[PDB]
Amino acid sequence: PLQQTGQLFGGLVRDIRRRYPYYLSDITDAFSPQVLAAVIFIYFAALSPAITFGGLLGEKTRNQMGVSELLISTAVQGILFALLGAQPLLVVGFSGPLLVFEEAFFSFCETNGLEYIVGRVWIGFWLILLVVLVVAFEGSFLVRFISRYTQEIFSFLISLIFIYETFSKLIKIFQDHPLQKTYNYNVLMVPKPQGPLPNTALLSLVLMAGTFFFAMMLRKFKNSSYFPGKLRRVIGDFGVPISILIMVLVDFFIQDTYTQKLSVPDGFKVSNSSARGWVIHPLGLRSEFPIWMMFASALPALLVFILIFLESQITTLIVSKPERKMVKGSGFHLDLLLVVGMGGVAALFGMPWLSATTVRSVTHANALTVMGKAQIQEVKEQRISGLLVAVLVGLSILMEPILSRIPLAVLFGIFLYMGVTSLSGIQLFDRILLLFKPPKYHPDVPYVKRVKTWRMHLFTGIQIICLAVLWVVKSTPASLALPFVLILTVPLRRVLLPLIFRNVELQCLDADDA
Amino acid sequence: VLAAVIFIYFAALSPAITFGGLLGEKTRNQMGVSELLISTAVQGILFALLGAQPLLVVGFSGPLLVFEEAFFSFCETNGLEYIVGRVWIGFWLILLVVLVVFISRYTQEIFSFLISLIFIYETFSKLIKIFQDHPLQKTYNYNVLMVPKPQGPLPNTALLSLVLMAGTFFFAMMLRKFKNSSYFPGKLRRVIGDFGVPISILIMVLVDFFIQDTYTQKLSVPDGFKVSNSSARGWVIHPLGLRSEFPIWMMFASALPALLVFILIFLESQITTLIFHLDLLLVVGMGGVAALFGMPWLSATTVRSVAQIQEVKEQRISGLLVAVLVGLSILMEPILSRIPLAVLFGIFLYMGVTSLSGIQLFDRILLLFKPPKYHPDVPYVKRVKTWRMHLFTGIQIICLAVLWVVKSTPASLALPFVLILTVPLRRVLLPLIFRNVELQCLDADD
Ligand SMILES: CCCCCCCC(=O)OC[C@H](COP(=O)(O)O[C@@H]1[C@H](O)[C@H](O)[C@@H](OP(=O)(O)O)[C@H](OP(=O)(O)O)[C@H]1O)OC(=O)CCCCCCC
Ligand SMILES: CCCCCCCC(=O)OC[C@H](COP(=O)(O)O[C@@H]1[C@H](O)[C@H](O)[C@@H](OP(=O)(O)O)[C@H](OP(=O)(O)O)[C@H]1O)OC(=O)CCCCCCC
Ligand SMILES: CCCCCCCCCCCC(=O)OC[C@H](COP(=O)(O)OCC[N+](C)(C)C)OC(=O)CCCCCCCCCCC
Ligand SMILES: CCCCCCCCCCCC(=O)OC[C@H](COP(=O)(O)OCC[N+](C)(C)C)OC(=O)CCCCCCCCCCC
Ligand SMILES: CCCCCCCCCCCC(=O)OC[C@H](COP(=O)(O)OCC[N+](C)(C)C)OC(=O)CCCCCCCCCCC
Ligand SMILES: CCCCCCCCCCCC(=O)OC[C@H](COP(=O)(O)OCC[N+](C)(C)C)OC(=O)CCCCCCCCCCC
Ligand SMILES: *[C@@H]1O[C@H](CO[C@@H]2O[C@@H](C)[C@@H](O)[C@@H](O)[C@@H]2O)[C@@H](O[C@@H]2O[C@H](CO)[C@@H](O)[C@H](O)[C@H]2NC(C)=O)[C@H](O)[C@H]1NC(C)=O
Ligand SMILES: *[C@@H]1O[C@H](CO[C@@H]2O[C@@H](C)[C@@H](O)[C@@H](O)[C@@H]2O)[C@@H](O[C@@H]2O[C@H](CO)[C@@H](O)[C@H](O)[C@H]2NC(C)=O)[C@H](O)[C@H]1NC(C)=O
């Protein structure tokens, strides 16, 4: 799949030929309760980031790109990707790096007196050209140089960021509504409460903790000996939806305390009608777009392409591992072409360009994974779950009566569950756990029996240093340099690490398969 | 010697303060943390100096708490003075001991399972009561006075109590798991898990201590070697009454509660000590004498978690030191007054949940929900039909339901008699329903 055929668009045609013969099975394998449970789970997992990032985007760009734009982008691009993608289990949506770039480019346009929504159009043009060139010459073969080292550093960092951000949201709730002796019990609640409210922070904490606990307990019950096997598996596959329902009902019967609920736009409208309309004129809206910027849009285009390419391709590598028991194949070239070209086209309508996100895609793949009776029997690979998730995200503006009843703390508990369950299957996390167990309890794995304990710990420590560096870079005003700092783990593995470790240790600690 | 003494001291102190808090809350501090601590100390010193088996641990238990609550409820119903009725029960206990001077896994496990259920149910009931005192409301009155206790609902009190209870229970459970996990050096892991309950109490007490604005009810502890409620009573209880004359008819009917208390203490000795008689006589006599001073009667219990002359002397000094420290723990009133009752509720739930482990009735109740292919390789699974074992478990569950109904009614004082009625049930009716092989598998001494 990552070989170079020497022909123009050879990898793309190979991906299409390999995956499209499976289309009827991609439709029919969706007929299972597990697929429906995964649809509900991933629908919440995909809607909540869209709303959060759309709110932040509207705040940071003055509603030139807001919540409705991101919802429409996610829905349409997810539908097209589920219909035409070589790896239908990838979930394409907004991410933190994309928001950071949008902020930086909006700042640049404001400083230089340019229209931000037209500079985005030209960035999209350049993204289309660049991805077409990369797929013509099969540049996705470079993905073969990203080994388990980089894949697992990236996955662990993303999971840690997920968990940290949900906890920071909870801490923010506690900061807005601190526990006080007295309150101004007639606080105004529009648009959001203007002052501290009693019981709000503790109730949010309780709701998050209860959702997390019920999800984890139903996960345990799925793999337990209780109840008939089929009913047990069905109930445990609906574990996350059941926990969400339980906690939403708990919140529904407490009418006196305030908790923040999901908010969606009132309709399918642009966030700022005065700023721009549905279709962006590339030559400008209220002023002529400069030619020098028409050409200089190639560097922001290169940065955006690097971000999207790295994120999506590492996600594809993670979900397509041989251990996970995927058998229908994955197309790096086709998926890259689809995602980047769709983002470039969406820039022409003012919508965000998206990326195959790591935690969401891994959660989607795990929700479709069938556990054999501590082993992975198979994965329900099909195009219906992602299609239905994208359709539901595109219909969320019409689902206000239901979504307005769902607290954000329940979804925080679900996000904590996603973050913790995404750590499974990552050998870096296993080796981090081994740092605390005595050597006599270390598992029977090649890197435990073939590598001395202190050398394996040193390997894990170098990886932890890489993680710390990445976290610091992400926390600084140089956050946009993260993709390059992560790319630096490839030369670190292929050049620096051989100077420390021996070949046998490096093959044991960085094996292609487990 | 010192490490074991510290471990035993904390193992004695945690249940002591938990039960003292519950008992002081129920009885309006007629008996509370101070009385329980002083009784434990004095009776432990006496048992370390005189008790034939110095390895036995004498202290308050869940059955004793249940009986104390039932007797307080009965005295409230009949307008009697509870602390004087206790004195006459103690007189009768002493008389019974002077007069004196069969229990199978069936009865023992029904008893322990009932106590566990009571602990869990009482924890949740206390939390519900807290939520009733301080409902979640849009608005509150900030002029609420707090001299005896909050006179109206307060914000964050019920939710914070729930959080403290849940956190204490979760930390105790997590440290219990960590005790037997593969993490950290074995010695440090086992030491940390040994003191798991104290550590969880400390963590949640600190959490509550650094939250200063919200109110949570705390332990009621006097300053010094004093009674929990001086206005209600003093140290010496005059048998004829403190505020009202004590009825003579009750002076004679105190023999029945005395018999029930004797049954409970003997049952606890059988469950723990057996799994001897003079030690039980000493404990019952000491409890009867302690009732004269308004202090709880205790019960001896095994599983202290430990040339012949030297060994006995060493464990006699261990009990003497632990009892002296438990008596001096009332001087740690600055620390004890900072312990929220929700933390102790979490510890109560932890005790109830963790005592379920090792009960074959609980294991068979779990098997009720498992497919037969998943049933373990135990004699009552392989030598008994699945439905016969399930019928055995169901009859035991019916016993539990009858005991719960009795505990719920005004006749809850007679609960020990209904418990002892499971001995005739095991010996008479069960042989009619079941075969000897099934009774040997389902009710075994090992
Ligand atoms: C709503 C449930 C009603 C019961 C279901 C209605 C049907 C019913 O009567 O179930 C009886 C069931 C035993 O199930 P049963 O023996 O018929 O079949 C077993 C099991 O149910 C699965 O079929 C297989 O185990 P798994 O696939 O590896 O797991 C295995 O079949 P196979 O491997 O040979 O092919 C069998 O061992 O016993 C309970 O679990 C108690 C119910 C829980 C308590 C429920 C009441 C509180
Ligand atoms: C607060 C921690 C302070 C650590 C202080 C000092 C920590 C420290 O000294 O490290 C050595 C230790 C290895 O100990 P080591 O291998 O020598 O000894 C093993 C094990 O630790 C127990 O001693 C025994 O296992 P168990 O009895 O059957 O359970 C067994 O000894 P035995 O069977 O032959 O008798 C041995 O297998 O490493 C860690 O386990 C975690 C490190 C801590 C993790 C990193 C902590 C940041
Ligand atoms: C497991 C036990 C959890 C117990 C939680 C106790 C909450 C403590 C609240 C302190 C007072 C307050 O809420 O204050 C709000 C403060 C912000 O400070 P401030 O009020 O704006 O100003 C300072 C005013 N002081 C100095 C008077 C306070 O936010 C916080 O930093 C608290 C964040 C709590 C995060 C909860 C993490 C839960 C972990 C479990 C995850 C499932
Ligand atoms: C996530 C936060 C991480 C920090 C918390 C974990 C602490 C781990 C330290 C105890 C491990 C242990 O005790 O392992 C026991 C092993 C025993 O193996 P040995 O071959 O006999 O040792 C040979 C002794 N040398 C090394 C002197 C030759 O000793 C070790 O050499 C531990 C590995 C030390 C190398 C550096 C490890 C990476 C540092 C931690 C990651 C930043
Ligand atoms: C860990 C599992 C915990 C389960 C136990 C929870 C106990 C709650 C008992 C409430 C009943 C009650 O007491 O209701 C009290 C008030 C009614 O107030 P009122 O109508 O003004 O009447 C005034 C008083 N009365 C009724 C005597 C007249 O209602 C409430 O605000 C309760 C809110 C319940 C939220 C509980 C949190 C849910 C957590 C879910 C698991 C994470
Ligand atoms: C905790 C509150 C009680 C709730 C109990 C809910 C679980 C009920 C199902 C148990 C497992 C099961 O299904 O039992 C199945 C057993 C197995 O029979 P077998 O012929 O040996 O199996 C071999 C052939 N099979 C598999 C085709 C049947 O047969 C029974 O029906 C047991 C019922 C006995 C009656 C007394 C039950 C008492 C239960 C407690 C009520 C007071
Ligand atoms: C919604 O947009 C208005 C208008 O934005 C301005 O006009 C557009 C046509 C486009 O050229 C934008 O870049 C302009 O900023 C926002 O109101 C503007 O606020 C900025 C900052 O204070 C100010 O420079 C503009 O003059 C304002 N324009 C007007 C007409 O008041 C408004 O903030 C946006 N809404 C939200 C919620 O952010
Ligand atoms: C301390 O005790 C007082 C008084 O108890 C009295 O004496 C006992 C021996 C017994 O006869 C009781 O029934 C007597 O009440 C408690 O005061 C009572 O408090 C409750 C609860 O607030 C109230 O309903 C009663 O009316 C009060 N009775 C009197 C006579 O004042 C007091 O609560 C106890 N203190 C604590 C901290 O628990």
* Residue B373: Cβ within 10 Å count: 7
Q: Quick check: B60 and B115 in contact, CB under 8 A?
A: no
Spatial CB neighbours of B48, under 8 Å, sequence gap ≥ 6: B54, B316, B317, B318, B319, B320, B323
Q: Could you tell me which chain A residue has the CA closest to the CA of B214?
A: A181
Q: Which two tokens stand for residue B80?
A: 């009697």
Q: Which two tokens stand for residue B94?
A: 């002493």
Spatial CB neighbours of A110, under 8 Å, sequence gap ≥ 6: A116
Q: Which two tokens stand for residue A59?
A: 């705040």
Q: Which two tokens stand for residue B290?
A: 């302690």
Q: Quick check: B221 and B333 in contact, CB under 8 A?
A: yes
Picking from B127, B131, B136, B183 by the largest number of A CB atoms within 10 A of its own CB, the best residue to mutate is B136
Q: Give the integer Cα–Cα distance in Å for B122 and B116.
A: 10
**Nearest one of A365, A339, A350 to A70, comparing CA atoms:** A350
Coil, helix or strand at residue A377: strand
Q: Quick check: B179 and B192 in contact, CB under 8 A?
A: yes
Q: What is the dihedral of CA B381, B385, B391, B397, to 10 degrees?
A: 10
CA distances from B27 to A274, B43, B223, B232 (A): 71, 22, 19, 11
Q: Could you tell me which chain A residue has the CA closest to the CA of B178?
A: A437
Q: Quick check: B33 and B225 in contact, CB under 8 A?
A: no
**Nearest one of A27, A66, A81 to A275, comparing CA atoms:** A66
Q: Which two tokens stand for residue A23?
A: 């289309």
Q: Which two tokens stand for residue A134?
A: 């990369």
Q: Give the integer Cα–Cα distance in Å for A169 and A174.
A: 9
Contact: A199, B156; criterion CB under 8 Å: yes
Q: How many CB pairs under 8 A join A and B?
A: 66
Phi, psi of A422 (to 5 degrees): -75, -15
Burial class (CB in 10 A: 0-12, 13-18, 19+), A102: buried
Q: Quick check: A168 and B203 in contact, CB under 8 A?
A: no
Q: What is the dihedral of CA A486, A488, A493, A499, to 10 degrees?
A: -150
**Nearest one of B336, B340, B337, B348 to B125, comparing CA atoms:** B348
Amino acid at B286: M
Cα end-to-end distance, chain A, whole Å = 20
Q: Give the integer Cα–Cα distance in Å for B388 and B385.
A: 5
**Nearest one of A78, A472, A35 to A234, comparing CA atoms:** A35
Q: Give the integer Cα–Cα distance in Å for A201 and A192.
A: 14
Interface residue A253 vs chain B (CB under 8 A): no
**Nearest one of A316, A341, A327, A437 to A126, comparing CA atoms:** A341
Q: Quick check: B344 and B17 in contact, CB under 8 A?
A: yes
Q: Which two tokens stand for residue A184?
A: 């101004």
Q: Quick check: B294 and B62 in contact, CB under 8 A?
A: no
The residue with tokens 């099975």 is: A25
DSSP B427: I
Resolution in Å equals 2.4
Q: Quick check: A514 and A447 in contact, CB under 8 A?
A: no
The sign of the torsion formed by the CA atoms of A448, A451, A457, A460 equals negative
Amino acid at A158: I
**Nearest one of B445, B428, B413, B418 to B85, comparing CA atoms:** B413
**Nearest one of A156, A25, A41, A130 to A91, comparing CA atoms:** A41
Picking from A170, A174, A188, A202 by the largest number of B CB atoms within 10 A of its own CB, the best residue to mutate is A202
Minimal Cβ distance to B136: which of A209, A226, A256: A256
**Nearest one of A58, A79, A82, A62 to A70, comparing CA atoms:** A58
Coil, helix or strand at residue A423: coil
Contact: A179, B136; criterion CB under 8 Å: no
Minimal Cβ distance to B163: which of A186, A206, A257: A206
Q: Give the integer Cα–Cα distance in Å for A106 and A122.
A: 14
The residue with tokens 């029996």 is: A449
Which residues in chain B (369-428) have CB-CB distances under 8 A to chain A?
369-371, 374
Phi, psi of A315 (to 5 degrees): -60, -45
Instruction: Establish how many alpha carbons lie within 13 A of residue A31's alpha carbon, considering only the half-sphere containing its beta carbon.
Output: 4
Length of chain A: 514
The residue with tokens 């939390």 is: B127
CA distances from A494 to A2, A278, A497, A499, B173 (A): 19, 47, 6, 10, 45
Coil, helix or strand at residue B445: coil
**Distance from the Cα of residue B174 to its chain's centroid:** 22
Q: Quick check: A54 and A369 in contact, CB under 8 A?
A: no
Q: Quick check: A355 and A336 in contact, CB under 8 A?
A: no
Q: Which two tokens stand for residue A510?
A: 């960085």
Spatial CB neighbours of B352, under 8 Å, sequence gap ≥ 6: B115, B116, B117, B118, B119, B120, B123
Which residues in chain A (192-211) have CB-CB distances under 8 A to chain B?
198-199, 202-203, 205-206, 209
* Residue A143: Cβ within 10 Å count: 18
The residue with tokens 């779950």 is: A385
Q: Quick check: B338 and B21 in contact, CB under 8 A?
A: no
What does the DSSP assignment read for A449-488? Answer: HSS-HHHHHHHHHHHHHHHHHHHHHHHSTTGGGHHHHHHT
Ligand 1 and B369: CB distance under 6 A: yes
**Nearest one of B417, B32, B413 to B254, comparing CA atoms:** B413
CA distances from B295 to B20, B35, B74, B323, B325 (A): 11, 5, 18, 15, 18
DSSP A352: P
What does the DSSP assignment read for B294-327? Answer: T----EEES-----HHHHHHHHHHHHHHHHHHHH
Spatial CB neighbours of B406, under 8 Å, sequence gap ≥ 6: B412, B414, B415, B418
Q: Give the integer Cα–Cα distance in Å for A55 and A466.
A: 32
Chain A residues whose beta carbon lies within 8 Å of the beta carbon of residue B370: 225-226
Minimal Cβ distance to A185: which of B138, B160, B182: B138
**Nearest one of A87, A129, A493 to A324, comparing CA atoms:** A87
Q: Give the integer Cα–Cα distance in Å for A143 and A137.
A: 14
Q: Give the integer Cα–Cα distance in Å for A27 and A385.
A: 10
Pocket around ligand 7 at a 6 A CB cut-off: A 62-63, 272, 274-275, 286
Q: Give the integer Cα–Cα distance in Å for B442 and B274.
A: 20
Q: Report the b/e string of A432-462 with b at 16+ CB within 10 A.
A: bebeeeeeeebeebebbeebeeeebbebbeb
**Nearest one of A450, A453, A457 to A439, comparing CA atoms:** A453
The residues facing A452 across adjacent strands are none
Strand locations in A63-121, DSSP E?
A: 92-93
What is the CA angle B43-B46-B50, rounded to 5?
Answer: 140
Interface residue B79 vs chain A (CB under 8 A): no
Q: Give the integer Cα–Cα distance in Å for B67 and B419.
A: 13
